[PDB]
Design a protein around this nucleic acid. Structure first.
Length: 164
DNA sequence: TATGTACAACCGAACGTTCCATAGCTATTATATACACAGCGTGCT
């Protein structure tokens, strides 16, 4: 996990857990210990940048979109939505995985790709209820979650996003 | 001269299983906090 993060190609805890069979508690405690060790030998003996921070959600979006087979235009829109999604306090505390998945789902229905949430959550191993629950929060601020140029050109209109 | 007799020469070792010794992890209780996930139950169609 540290090695992936240092290379700017960071992965998620679940993705690494798919190969190495270790439950979450031991994983977290070991990671905290090793980070302290690296920091300790960075001062006495660099190590981290803006990347070392846990969330760094923008890095996950390109791979998650690839798993769904979306075009690059949707991926860029998802990155913009996820980047601006941190201004909302009702969602900012959520896990970076959900922040990226809900942003991807918002754009999937914005460009009208026929992929249902039942498969988006099944592909990225995220509960469908969580996806739709988060989508509701990412509906009161849609004007701030869509790139101005895309709406200006005419590629996407905000009336294609269903409203509850 | 002839015949006898005598003499001289030409099984190891690799692997597996059991037996001490030390240290560490596991489980439980309480509490605030918050997220995600897996259930159960009730109304709707």
């Amino acid at each position: 996990l540290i090695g992936c993060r240092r290379a700017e190609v960071a992965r998620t805890f679940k993705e690494i857990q798919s190969l190495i069979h270790v439950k979450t508690k031991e994983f977290g405690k070991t990671l905290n210990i090793m980070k302290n060790i690296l920091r300790g030998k960075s001062e006495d003996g660099k190590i981290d940048t803006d990347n070392m921070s846990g969330a760094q959600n923008l890095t996950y979006i390109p791979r998650f979109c690839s798993h769904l087979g979306l075009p690059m235009q949707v991926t860029t829109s998802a990155e913009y939505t996820a980047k601006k999604c941190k201004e909302i306090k009702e969602i900012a505390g959520k896990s970076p995985i959900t922040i990226a998945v809900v942003s991807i789902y918002l754009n999937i229905l914005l460009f009208q790709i026929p992929i249902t949430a039942a498969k988006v959550g099944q592909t990225l191993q995220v509960t469908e209820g969580t996806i739709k629950s988060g989508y509701k929060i990412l509906y009161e601020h849609r004007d701030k979650l869509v790139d101005p140029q895309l709406i200006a050109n005419g590629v996407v209109s905000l009336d294609n996003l269903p409203g509850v």
